[PDB]
Each structure stands twice: as structure tokens, then as C-alpha cells.
Design a protein around this ligand. Sequence first.
Ligand SMILES: Nc1ncnc2c1ncn2[C@@H]1O[C@H](COP(=O)(O)OP(=O)(O)O)[C@@H](O)[C@H]1O
Ligand SMILES: Nc1ncnc2c1ncn2[C@@H]1O[C@H](COP(=O)(O)OP(=O)(O)O)[C@@H](O)[C@H]1O
Ligand SMILES: Nc1ncnc2c1ncn2[C@@H]1O[C@H](COP(=O)(O)OP(=O)(O)O)[C@@H](O)[C@H]1O
Ligand SMILES: Nc1ncnc2c1ncn2[C@@H]1O[C@H](COP(=O)(O)OP(=O)(O)O)[C@@H](O)[C@H]1O
Ligand SMILES: [Zn+2]
Lengths: 72, 443, 437, 434, 429, 99
Amino acid sequence: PMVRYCSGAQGSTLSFPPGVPAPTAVSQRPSPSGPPPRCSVPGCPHPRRYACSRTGQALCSLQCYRINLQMR
Amino acid sequence: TQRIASHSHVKGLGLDESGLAKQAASGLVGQENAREACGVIVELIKSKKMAGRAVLLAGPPGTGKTALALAIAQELGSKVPFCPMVGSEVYSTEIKKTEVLMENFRRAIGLRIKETKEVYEGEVTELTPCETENPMGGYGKTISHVIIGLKTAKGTKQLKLDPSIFESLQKERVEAGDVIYIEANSGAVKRQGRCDTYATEFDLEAEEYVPLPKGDVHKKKEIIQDVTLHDLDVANARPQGGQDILSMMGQLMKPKKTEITDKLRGEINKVVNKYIDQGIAELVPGVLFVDEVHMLDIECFTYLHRALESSIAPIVIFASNRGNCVIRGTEDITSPHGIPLDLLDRVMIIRTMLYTPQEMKQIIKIRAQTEGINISEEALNHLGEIGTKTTLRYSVQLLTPANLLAKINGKDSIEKEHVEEISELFYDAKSSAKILADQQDKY
Amino acid sequence: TQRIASHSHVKGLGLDESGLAKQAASGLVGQENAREACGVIVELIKSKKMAGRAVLLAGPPGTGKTALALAIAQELGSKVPFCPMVGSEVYSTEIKKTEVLMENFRRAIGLRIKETKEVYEGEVTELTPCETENKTISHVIIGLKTAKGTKQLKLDPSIFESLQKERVEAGDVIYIEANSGAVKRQGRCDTYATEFDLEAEEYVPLPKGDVHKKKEIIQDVTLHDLDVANARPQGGQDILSMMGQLMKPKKTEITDKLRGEINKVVNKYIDQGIAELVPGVLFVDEVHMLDIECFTYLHRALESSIAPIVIFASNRGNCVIRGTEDITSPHGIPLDLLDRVMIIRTMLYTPQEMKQIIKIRAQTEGINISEEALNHLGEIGTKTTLRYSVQLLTPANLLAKINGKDSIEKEHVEEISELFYDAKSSAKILADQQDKY
Amino acid sequence: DVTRIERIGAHSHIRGLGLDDALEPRQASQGMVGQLAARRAAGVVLEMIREGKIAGRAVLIAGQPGTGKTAIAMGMAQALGPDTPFTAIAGSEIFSLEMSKTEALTQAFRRSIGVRIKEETEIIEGEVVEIQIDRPSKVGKLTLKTTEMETIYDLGTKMIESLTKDKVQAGDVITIDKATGKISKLGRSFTRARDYDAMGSQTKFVQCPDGELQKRKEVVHTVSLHEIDVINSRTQGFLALFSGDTGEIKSEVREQINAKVAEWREEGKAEIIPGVLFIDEVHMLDIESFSFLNRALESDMAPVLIMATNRGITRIRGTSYQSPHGIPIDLLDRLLIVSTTPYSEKDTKQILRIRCEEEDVEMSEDAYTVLTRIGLETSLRYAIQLITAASLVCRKRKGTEVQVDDIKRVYSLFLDESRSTQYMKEYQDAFLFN
Amino acid sequence: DVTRIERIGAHSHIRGLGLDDALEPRQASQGMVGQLAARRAAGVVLEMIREGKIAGRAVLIAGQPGTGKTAIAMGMAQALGPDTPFTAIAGSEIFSLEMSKTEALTQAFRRSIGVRIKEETEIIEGEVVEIQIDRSKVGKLTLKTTEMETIYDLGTKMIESLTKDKVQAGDVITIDKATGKISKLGRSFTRARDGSQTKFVQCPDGELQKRKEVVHTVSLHEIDVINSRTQGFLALFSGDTGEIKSEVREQINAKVAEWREEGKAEIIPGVLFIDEVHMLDIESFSFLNRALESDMAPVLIMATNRGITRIRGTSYQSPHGIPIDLLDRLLIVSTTPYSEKDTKQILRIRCEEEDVEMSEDAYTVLTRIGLETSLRYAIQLITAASLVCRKRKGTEVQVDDIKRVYSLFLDESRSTQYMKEYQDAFLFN
Amino acid sequence: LCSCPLLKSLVFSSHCKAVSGYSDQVVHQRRSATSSLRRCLLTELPSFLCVASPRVTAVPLDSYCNDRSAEYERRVLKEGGSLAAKQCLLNGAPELAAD
Ligand SMILES: Nc1ncnc2c1ncn2[C@@H]1O[C@H](COP(=O)(O)OP(=O)(O)O)[C@@H](O)[C@H]1O
Ligand SMILES: Nc1ncnc2c1ncn2[C@@H]1O[C@H](COP(=O)(O)OP(=O)(O)O)[C@@H](O)[C@H]1O
Ligand SMILES: Nc1ncnc2c1ncn2[C@@H]1O[C@H](COP(=O)(O)OP(=O)(O)O)[C@@H](O)[C@H]1O
Ligand SMILES: Nc1ncnc2c1ncn2[C@@H]1O[C@H](COP(=O)(O)OP(=O)(O)O)[C@@H](O)[C@H]1O
Ligand SMILES: [Zn+2]
């Protein structure tokens, strides 16, 4: 029930008993999303600064926010 | 650009190959004896054969001994350290004068140590707990090594590390894509922060995004760091590590200059001797400068004897603009130049003399060309008459308002009417002093 | 062996039972009136019924005033506390000049205290904290195993904080006291040393005797040590006492309310009879260096009822008072304090009495000196000073060891006196070369 | 080409007092020349210090400026030996705004006395074979290898905490102390470290030890009474020694330290050795420190001290009356005075000849006439500086032998104090505060 | 037989100040002899302070050295009476590097003035026969006194306080119903049978639970330290407190004024006393004027032995060592020297106080010593004379023994005479 | 200083333990029982030192009040003070206490 760290001259070894849980889990970075988010009014589009609940759409600035709110 | 300094026009001594001093060199004219004497002094500094040598510079005010002393450092270069200190800084409330002078002696001398560094940095592509197969009845599972991936713009590299470091990787927060600092020699693992690539997924996140390091995964570079014996004495004086509660609270307390015992000085001398014997560290001597030496206390004058008799004392230069004066700290004691005869016998005195009117005109021309001001012939003659009448310094100060007023009037060059109006508005020190005598009853 | 001291050969005043002063006794000769005058002083200090008394010693430099002070210090014994002080010691940057003189009285007066302590010590077999709802520890359960027997006891969360402070683990021997509340750790028992071939902790054997033992401890402490203990909370079981224990111990002034409270609790201890108070003796050398302000406070200080006896030493005559810049007073002491102090007259030693001092010191240094060299050293001593002939003893012995002679000779004394210069001859030589100085 | 922390200096060339076994002074030895009287007296005080049976003594040295009063103190300082403690302090150094002057004097007296303590400890030194640790208290084993014998030991809780705190892995040569508990890693093995993990850490390598694994060593040390008093006064103040923040230590702690050190001497575990306290230009010291020094010197632990006085018949600082050597008659009569005879013409040539062997500068026979005359008219220190700068200009002319023209060049470059005063009289009216 | 902290001093031989209802001092009363006018004026000042209807008044005492005006001052302090504020300081004590001179003098004026506040609290006291605790935890104890017997139930906090300090059967203790601190006063004689055996206290009498009115006097400086520092007891007892801001002191003054306006508490003026004021700085000399011109100020008395002398800090020679600004601010009471007839009376009462038996020839010769020399020297002669008499084994002091002591100790004038002969050998004559 | 092991060894001074530079070099004598003097910068010798101790120790004073709330503030002040400050002083940080 006690984990055994055995370090020899040929190499290092860290052994765990079957009773203890496995401390290790394989972790790899997921594939990144290719397209960036864009603004609502599509003469603007830039990475989205904030999301709008009333219009339900993301906007960068209040300028385009007026056009989006007017269109909705 | 750089603000023009009064001494900024002095680039060095301008010595010849045979040792003689050229008449006009590095913006310095006249004073051949002083420039040659300092020319031997810099040979003593470069030779490093002697220590504790004290030079004295005496003469009337405005003779340029400060320009020569500052020219010494410019002629020597940036390799050897130079520490100008006025005598006014010797008096201090918290730190005693002897500790000030000692810390200056440690400030002059300095060291340079070359060191190589190996660092692994980059974005983490994958982290795997590599499992070798060695089933045993005593303990079921075995893990041989942990593989850590690293990605950089120049290339990607994987590393095989012992599982013991995975205990720290699990002890502190480590996420996919975290840029981390890992040194091979130290073996410690630090977390720099999240990569800038993942900052686009969230509109708001608490973690700051550091960019991915540009370069090879394994970076081994040799850098030479210069650290003075004074810096070593401060680092040895107070602990830098804040792991202790007393180090944290003491770090919260206000720092004050503390008197350093001679034992620490001796230990520094011993370890420095060891590193010099190893040849890894390079030791260079410093050049200590002192201005207004007549302002020192008699206790400092007597302390400079035991300070200079030591073999660790760097070369010290003195500047005294005063003649025979009463020694500070004693009412009835008078000594030439303002220094006691005991230290005055040990120091090497160098005499300086006032410039002739021609040298005044030449220095005025040098300062004019330095500040970028044009002077007409006749106005330069009248200005030389003004400087000869009062002082060179005042004639140097008269250059700026005539240039500004000349630009305002539209003339790109200074004229005799400009220096005449300036000389009429402004008053020289002696003229003002004479005017104060008539109205002194009203003052 | 013990290093030879200048006053080491003085064993006391050398007085008979009748109070008279013998010619040569206790390594002291001459000064019969001074020693006989101190014979009543030691009876006053030993009588203890009087306080606020100051005895000034007036005499030329080198007449043994300090030898009389230390002679009284050796005459009163080791039980009587004796505090030497120099006039230059009262100046301090941390505290005021008055606080030093006020603390020298508490440091002078000693106190003997008997303390009955109950001790619980032995091996710790088991230690567990109790858990109570607020996860707080209400009580502690710790068993104690000894060769005599095993007894389980309960401890407080503060004592548990001292144990966890000492990193106490099961299987170690600890020392626990009740009234003080402090906790000590002796170490790990020797029985467990065999399980590990290599261990950092040192092993001590298992103690013997009963776990709980009440014992009496007689300790001698000074009212100044008590005054500092009550002044600052250096010791204790508090975490703030540990932080202050880490802080620098700078000197601070003590309030008169704390001093009066000390007088109250010590008076209660005297009423209980458990504590025994003994008076001290305060000695002041180079009193002419003390400031007129220090004398001004000495007016009230000597007039105090609790002030221990103070002896002063003045080696100088009429001189300007420190700080007055104008008025000059006899013996550097103003007339106000000089009227209160009791003056003792000291006389210069005679040419016949000097040779006996030279012989006694020569025997104290372990040197064999012939009668001829003794008469010569006495002659030159009377020509200049006694201190000179006292200082010429050792180097002549060194020349005797170099030349192999078993005793000092007139050529050795002549060579040493030829090498060294007297103050008079040197001062005369400074006149001719004074222009070069 | 390598330059140490030490460089050539005025009093640094002296290797000792140059004395015979008879203590009679030799004319030229150990870098010192002339002044047979003060050399013999310095021999007396050196033999006295080496005897060390007497304590509480003061020796004073007086004479004209330039007679070598400091050269004698440095001569006995270098001739005393490394194992004997020596301390050189100045009157302006004991003056401090943090602590009192008398407290600084106590730090000087207690600082001069050295204490030598010997320690015998059994340590284990070998190359690690393997390291095993079991964590559930953690229990592990350590296997070591030496050429003579291979050993296996068991590790405890504190031992595993110490090794894991020191980051010790298999393949490193380490040193473990059984009684102390300290572990110090010397390095790694070449063959055991030849095959390493892909981390590739390159630091140091140490060959495998030979002989017995556990050996007994003796390490001797010396501790100052001031050091012990600061450590025990500050309550774990080990940092306050190098920091210098401690001050105004209570006298009771000092008394208890003196009694405990006396008990240590009675036990024989620790030994007490005398030390020297050198004071230069003591005439400027305040009279209060003199009155405290006269009575403070009477202590049994007070070491013998040596003071130097440049001038004579001068008033003491803080007093309006003059006294010989700026010292009160109590102290001046309390210590012995040793006068130094001014040097003659014959000795000056030899003093200037010492610089030939010390500085490795070849000097012509014709240079000693003019240089010796400059030594007669001016100060011998200015003569030595004339030798140094004369050698600099000689190197500038690339000559092996010194020429008189170079000495005339240096003499034209640098002026004497009297000459600077002469020009300062002509230009003195233009100078400030004439 | 045991030696108390106090021992016989110069001022300790007298207790109180003898006076009359008509303020006519007796020739010898309360140990003091002579100085009828001085004791009358000091009695007028004492009755003024006992009245306490005014504030901010100063009175000075003047006299030759050896007139004992300090002894009449300490005797006045003894006759002042308990439970009244009094402070004794010296002119040289106010100088300190830790605290400024103005903050020290003002600190003395704060310590002099005090406030009396009365409260009422319920406190239980008595012998505890039995205690029972069952583990929340519920327990009951029995409180028995000679008059009545009671039983009480405890809560959680009371059970914690009981388990903190273990109390056996039949132990006399004091339980506070406010804070909850249990303190054991002692153990009963009968119940303590069958340990340390430190003390034994009889069973208390009266009502078990009573409401007691506590009269507590606090000092303005004490309250100011408590409010300024986090812990005023550690600040005051530690001495680290200094340079306290004046705004907090002014706020405390306004709050005390509000307390007096409420009438729940009263303020009691204190008696400040200053010794050796002949040498003092003009900063304190000038600050005393405004400090007395303040609204609430204690009544002070200062002693100056010296006459006209130059004050410290200036080259001006002030009368009585004090500037005219402070001299005109207070009234001066001069003391006359002691008569020959009173000298022997002082010697006799010092023989009664010090328990010394001498003869009439001893009082006569010692009276001659009082005529030629100051009385203090004779008072110092008798003390050393008793011991020489003890060495002579005689039951009475003899003139020959007085001659032996007189040969052992010399007067300052005699030491000056010998110091004139040896003065050339002395340093810095 | 942490990035370079040599610059770290250049500063021996640490507030935790004592340091002494007494032994500059090591001299070893090889035999059946070997004796070799120590070297470099590492020396402590804590055993002989610290024997001296103060004679008396006093407990800090406490205030006694007539209400319950001041007993609450007194028990909190005396026992734990602030919890995170107590653990922060003992382990140096609260996250160092949980750590
Ligand atoms: N020979 C020179 N050539 C050019 N400028 C000079 C010369 N000597 C002095 N100066 C100028 O005079 C200014 C003041 O010099 P100052 O420091 O007063 O000289 P000193 O220290 O000799 O009195 C300096 O800023 C410098 O530029
Ligand atoms: N009566 C005496 N008998 C023996 N030794 C004496 C006597 N008087 C003085 N000495 C010695 O002379 C030395 C110097 O005395 P010192 O302390 O200078 O006297 P003072 O204190 O009066 O100046 C002392 O060490 C003391 O041992
Ligand atoms: N005995 C000696 N042997 C060799 N050189 C000496 C001797 N005495 C003095 N000197 C030289 O004289 C120079 C000046 O000596 P200095 O320090 O002025 O003597 P003092 O300290 O007596 O005034 C020193 O640089 C030193 O080299
Ligand atoms: N009324 C008195 N009755 C008896 N003795 C007195 C009286 N007043 C003063 N003394 C004596 O005077 C001595 C103290 O005098 P002190 O107060 O020092 O005089 P001064 O104030 O003039 O200096 C005491 O020892 C005391 O015996
Ligand atoms: Zn937009």
C-alpha cells in the first residue's frame, strides 16, 4: 500500500502498488479551432469583444451594436 | 537625445604615443603637467601593481581638475569601474562615515564571472507517463519515465525525465499549452503562464497569456555577469530568500544601511581568492574619486591613514579647491589646502594653474562648438575681455542667453550687441558683491 | 591556568578582629586609616539596616582606590552582589543616561528565590488530540511510559501547541512542567537506535524515577533581570513571544509603575518568607566623568529609601564640572552631591612601603628576584613611580629566561629600564623635538 | 599574470620582525631594517605574547612621523603567526551611531582573545549505488560502493527528509554525518554518470573514494568571545554576526559567557589563547574611552594591547588642558612608552634597496646617491613613491636600469607638500578661505 | 527581622506633617521640628489641594542647602493621605532620547491628574463542596457558605471554564458572573484534608451572590496609552510608547469633559512635585507656564536649593535659577536654617528612629559638630558611630568612639584642605 | 542567483543556519583509519554555543473586563488571533499550511 521509488545506477523507476489509485493520466492538447469568432455586422468582423443577449450575437463595439440592435 | 552636460565635452586626456600631452586633445587645452601626471596615473591603474595610492589635485577654482579626473575614466574605458563621491555624502544619519568610506572602497573594485546556462522552453504539446512493463509481486505497477513534449517556432523536441519531477508537475497547476521554464542544471520547474494561442477561445480569463518563446527548445548560452564586491557585501549582508518569516517581515521593514563587520570582508576576500585561483572569475580594480576633500572630518582624515595602509584599498584621487584653511572639527588647527599634514604627506599633490586669456578664448570656442553656437570674431574678443575681467566660468555661462536671444532676434550668429545686452542684464558675482556693499545697511 | 590579573593578588582588606589594620595582610600594605575606615563600612553592608549611603574615595592615582573597592568586594563574599560601573558606561544611544543609573540599583540588589516545581517527564507512548465542534482541539490525551510505570495524562491545547512546536513525535522523551507551561524535548530513546543503521537524531537513555516529582530549586536572580523580564515579553509560550524572541533585544526604559509593582510582588514574597532579599553594593569608578545631570539624578537616587550602598572613586582634584562650562568643583563632584557623600582620605605610599609592593607583585608573577634588583627597582620606583617598577618585572624575567639565568640581575633591570622610557623623561624629550611633532 | 585580492603596499612587504633566538635585533632581516631598540622591544612583547601567562598589559609606541611605528606593528603582526589571533582597529572605527564607544571597546577586547576548539566526528564517504524510498512514515534504503568495501545502510524519516531535501539521486558521491545528520554531495561518478537520463544535466564529476567508508576526522576551529556573545545574546543570531545590526548587549549575558568559558577551560574541551589589539593614532580618542579603558583593562580576560602615538604635548579632545601624547597621566603612566629613534642616512640606502628585491626593479648604483639625498631632504614615503613612479617612467623608456633623468621627470611631475604650500602662498589670495 | 524593600532614609524618619485646627504648628510634631512658617504655608497648600475646587496653581519652595525642605516635601506627601494622585519627578529625569522633553513633562502632567469612576458588578464567592460534569456538556456544582447552601447549573462555556482549572471538593473560590474567570482563593481546613498544600482559607460568610460597587481610579496618561497603542499595558509597561499625537489627547480631554458633564464620574486633581529645578532648560521653563494656563492642570510644588545662578542654555543670570516669567507665575516660601536648640532635638529623634543610645556629652559634642558643620554630616557620623560602639561592646555610645569615627571619616572642607596640599599631584588641578 | 549554481555558492550567508569559513582546504591522511580535515565554506558547531539562557521569564499581561464580549476578544486574541494569520505565521502562508 506504500508507493516505492527505486532509483538505481542504470536508471530511475517509480513503482506504485495496485491498491493506490493511478496518479497519472495522459493529457494532450486538443486541436485548436481554425476560424476565429467574428463581429455581427459583416463589414466589421473582428475577434468578438463581447456577446449580446438581447440580439443574441457577439459585437466588438457599440457602433456595430447600434446596427445589430436596429436590425433585430 | 542626450542632455548636454558641462563636462560632456571632455572625452579623455588625449595622450600621445610617447607619453607627452598634446596641446589640444579631446577638448582639453593647456595643463600639460597635469595631463601628463594623470597620464602616468592611468598607467598605474592599468598596471595594477600598487594599491592604496592616493593622488591629490590642488589649484584655483575653474582649472579643470574635475574635467581631468573625469577624463581619466573616459580614457580608461568601461572595463574598470569608476566611483565619484563627494565629501558631503560621507556625513550621514543612519550609516557612519567609516562604513561609508569602506563601502566606497568595496564599490570601486568589481568582478566578472562567466557562466553557461541551459534552458528548455516552449509550448507543451503532450505529457505522457511512459510505462515500462516490469510486473512484480511486491508492487503491481511500474513507471520508468515521464515524457514531456515541447514545441517552438524553430523546432519541436521531446524530453525523457525521471518520474520524480512528475510529483512537482502534479503538485502545481500544469495545463496543456502552458509555457514553462525548466533548467537542466538546477532541475527546478517553474510555470511561466498560458500560451497566447489559446487566448481567443474565451472573452474573459483570469490567466495571463505569455507568448510562445521564439528559439530552439534547448538553449545553452554563456553570459559574463559583472558584480562588484560591494554588491557581494550587500547580498552577503542580508538574505535574499524570503522563505523565512524573519526574512519576509524584515523584507517588509524599511531597508537601512547597516554597519558590516570585518569578518564578512575577510570571507569575501577568501572566496574571491579561491575563485581567482580557479581562474573562472576575473578581478579588475576600481578608481575612487573624491571631490571637496576639505569638507571631511578630522576623524575621517585620520581614518584614511588606516584605510590607505591596507593592501585592499583601491586607488583614490582627491580634489581640493581651497587653500590654507582651518581643519573641520578643530577650531585652532590650521593646515595647508585644508588637509592635515599626516594624510597630506601620504597623498601625491598635483598643482594646477589658471588659464591665460588666449586659453579662455579657446575654451569658449570649444564650448560654443559643443553647444552648437556660432560666435563672431569681435564678440569673441569682447567676451574674452569679460572672462579675463571676471572668470572663465561666467564667460561660458554668457553663451546660452546670447544664442537664444539671437535666435529670437533672427540672427543665427551671436553679435557684440547681443553679448552687450546680455552682459548688461546679467551681473557677475564680483560686481554683485560690490553692489551689496552700498546697500548692505538696508539688507 | 587562570590568567594573572592586576588586582588578583588582593584577597581583601586584611583587618584583624579588633578592626585595626595590620601592616601587611591580604596582599595589601599601608593605608591603615583607609582600611580601618572600611572596617566599619563592611559592618554596615553586612548589617543591612541602613540604605542610601555613599562613600567617596579620594586619593592620588595609583594609591589603590580600586584595590580597596575590589578588596571590599572580596571581603563581603560571593553572596553579596557587587556591581562595578565606569563613568563612561552611562552614555548609551538606545536609552537615556538616567535609565542606566536607575537600573544599576536593581542590578545591584540581589534576590534569592526558592521555587517548588512539579515535573512530569518520561517516554511518550501515545499522543492524540481530541476533536470538538466549534474542527477545534479541546483537549489532548498523552500517555507516559517509564521504567516505574505508565500513566496517561491530559494536556491543554497550548501545551499541544508547544509540542507541535518542538516537533514531538511518538517514541521520544520530553520534559513537561506545569507552573511555567514551557515544553522541552530531551530526545529519542536509545531502544529504537537499532532499527536504523544511520540516523540524524541523537539517542538518550530512558530516565529513571517517578513520572511526577516535586522538587525545590533555589535560584539567585537580580531585580534588574526581573525588571527586564517584566519589561519585555521575551520568554513565553505565545507566538508573539516567539516573534519577539526573533526580534532584536534593544534596550528600553522601565516605567515607575512597573518598578512599584515589582516592589509590591517582591514585598509579598518577603511576607510569605519564600524569597530572601540581600542588599547589593554599587561601585562607581571615574566619577568625575559623570555629567552634572547624572549627579542631579543622584541627588534623588541617594536619598531614595531602597537605594543600595554606593561607593565612588575620585582620582582627581579641583576640576571643571562636566557640562557647566564655568563652575569648577573639588574632586569633579559638585558641592551638592559632595556634601552628601562621605569622603575617605588616601595617602601616597612611602619609599619603604613601595619595595614591599614590588616584592609581593614580583612573587605573584612567579619571578625570583635578588635583593639587589629589589633595592634597585625600589630606588627607581621612588625616583619615578610604582607602576613603572611594577611593569618592569615581567620583561626582566623574559631576559632572564633568554640568558638562562634563574633570577633577575642588575644588568637585566638596567637593560629593561634602558629600553623603556619613563613618562617624565619622555615628556622632557618631547620638548626638544616638539617643533617636529 | 593572475592578481590576488592582495596587492603591493607600504607595510605589506614586511614578513616579520627579523629577530634571532636570543631576541637580540638583527640589522636586516624579515624585511625590516634599523631601529634596534624598538625591534628589541617588539621582540620582548612578541615573546611575552607567545608566553601568554600574563594578562591585562598595555604597551605604547611613540616617535617622530616616518620612523616606522606602523611598520613595527605590522612586523610583529606578520611574525606572530597565523594560528595566533590578531586585531588591528583605529580610533575612528569604534565611533558609531548605532552602538556606544565603550561597547565597541568591549567588542575589541573580547574580540582580540581567541578560543580554539577541536571536534572529532565520524562521517561516511562513498559512492551511492542505489536509493530506495517507500511512502505510505517513509522508509527506504541506501546502497553505497567503495573500492575497499561495498555497504548497505537503512535510512530513517529525518534521513530521507534530509536526502530528499538535498535532491540526492543514485550515482552521486555524498558525505553523511551520523552524529550531526548533515549530508553534503561532493559530485558524481564518471562511469555511473556516463549513462544518464535524457535530461542531460552537466554539473560536476568526482572519482570514487577508496578505503573505509566510515572514517573519523578532526576539524579544529576558533570562535571569538564577541561572536559567542552575539550568537547567544541574539537568540539564534547567526545572521547578526555578518549583518552587524546587534548592539548594546547586556552585561549579564557577557558575565555568564565569561563564567561558562572559564568552565570550559576547566573541562579542557576548549582552550583560550591570547591576542593582540593594535591601535594607531590613539591621541584623538576621547578621554571617556581612556577612563573606561584604564578600569576595563584590569579584567582577567583583558588581552594585552599596543597603542601608537604620533605627536606629543597636545590637549585631549573634549578637554581644554594639554597633556603629553594627548593621553591623561593615568593611562600614560599606566602603560610603558617605547620611543623610536629617527633613521639615519646609512639605513635609508638599505630601505630603498629593499624595494629593488620587493618590486623587482633593477636600480643603478648612481641612483642611490640622488635618491638617497631626496630621502634625506624629503620623506622616505615620497622616496618610495619616487621609486614606483620612477620605475613606471623607466618602463616608459623601456630601460632595464633606472636612469637619473627618469627620476628627474617624476620629480618634475609631482611636488612635495612644502612646494605645494609655497605655490599655495602665491595663489593663496585667489584660493578660498585663505 | 526580615528586611523590607523600604529602609530608613533621610525623609523616612518622619511620618506625616504635624498641624493644628488653627494651623499653628507645634515645636515637635509628626517627627518634624521647627520651620513654623514653612509648615504653616505647606499646610495651607495641603488644605488647598484637599479642597480641590481650583486648578492650575503653582507654589515654589526656597531655602538654603540643608534646610530639609525636601524632607518637609516628602513629609507633606506622607500627610497627603491614601487614594490621592501624587507624582514625584526630577528636573534631570525629563531628558530622554526615547521621548521628547515636552512629551515627558506633559506626560507627567497627565500622570498627575486622575479620574475616579464607580461601578457595580455581580460577583459570586464561596466554598465549593462538590462539582459534577457530564459530557454539549451539562454539569452542576454546589456552592456552600456558612449562612446558606446553593446548587448551580453550568452551560457550555462554564463547563469549559471548570475543565480549564480543576477544582477539588470543598475549595473556596471566586466565580465572576461577567467574564467567566474562575479563581481559587484557598482551601478549607476541614475539606482540604486527605497535594501542594499552598494555602488555607476559612469558609466565607454573608450572602453568596452580592452586587459590589467597585471604586476605580484611572490616569489620563494610562487611558491615552491604552487608546493610542493596540495594547496599552504592553505599551506602558514596555516603555516603547512615545511621541503620542496631541489630537487623540485633545479628544480624550473632550470626552472626559463630557463625562464630568454627565456626572457619572468625577475628576481628582493630582499633586506634581519637581526636584532640583535650579538647572533646567528654558523650553520646559516656558512650557510650565502654558501647561499651568491649561484648563485642567494638577497642583505642583518645585524645590530649588541653589540661589541666583545662570540658567542652562542661555548666558543670562536669572534670580533663583529661574526666569522672571516663571518666578512671577508662582509664590515662593522661604525656609530658615535650624536653631542650635533644634539640632540636638533632631539628633535625639534620629537616635529614637535609628535605635541608638548615646549620652549627653555625645549630644553636646555632636551639637558642636552641628554648629561648625552641617547637620547632615553629623547624621552621617552617628550611623557609623553605632557600629564602632558595637565593636566596643558598650551599651552606650561614647565620645571616644565618636572621635574614632570622626577620625575615620572627614568633612568635605577637610578633604578640600588635604586636597589643597596634594592638589599639585592630582590631575588637572 | 538561483539560475547559476556558482553564483549561489558565492553567497554562503543564510539566516537559517550558521556559517564559518575557517577551513579553506582539505588535507587527508589515508590509512586503515583515515582522518581528513574539512574544507570550503560549511561550518556550524551549534552544540557548544547557546548554553547561556535568561534567568527568569515572564508571561505577557492580559486585560480583565466586566462584560462577555471583551472575554470573546480576549480569548480570540490570546488563542488563535486570526486563523489565516496564525497558520500564515506558523507555515508562513495559508496555502503553505494546506501545502
Ligand atoms: N582645459 C579645459 N578645456 C576645456 N574646458 C575646461 C578646461 N578646464 C575646465 N573646463 C571647464 O570648466 C568647467 C568647470 O571646471 P571645474 O570643475 O570648476 O574645474 P576645477 O575643478 O579645476 O575648479 C568644466 O565644466 C569644464 O568643462
Ligand atoms: N596597599 C597596597 N598593597 C598592595 N598593592 C597595592 C596597594 N595599593 C595599590 N596596590 C596595587 O597597585 C596597583 C595600581 O593601583 P591603582 O588601581 O592605580 O590605584 P588607584 O585606583 O588609587 O589609582 C593595583 O593593581 C594594586 O594591586
Ligand atoms: N624598519 C623599517 N624597515 C623598512 N622600511 C621602513 C621601516 N620603517 C619605516 N619604513 C618605511 O617608511 C615608510 C613610511 O613610514 P611611516 O608609516 O611614515 O612610519 P611611522 O608610522 O612611524 O610614521 C613606509 O612606507 C615604510 O616602508
Ligand atoms: N523637620 C525636621 N526634623 C528633623 N530632621 C529634619 C527635618 N527636616 C529635615 N531634616 C533632616 O534633613 C535631612 C535632609 O535634608 P535635605 O532635605 O537634603 O535639605 P535640603 O532640602 O536643604 O537639601 C534629613 O536627613 C533629615 O534628618
Ligand atoms: Zn463591430
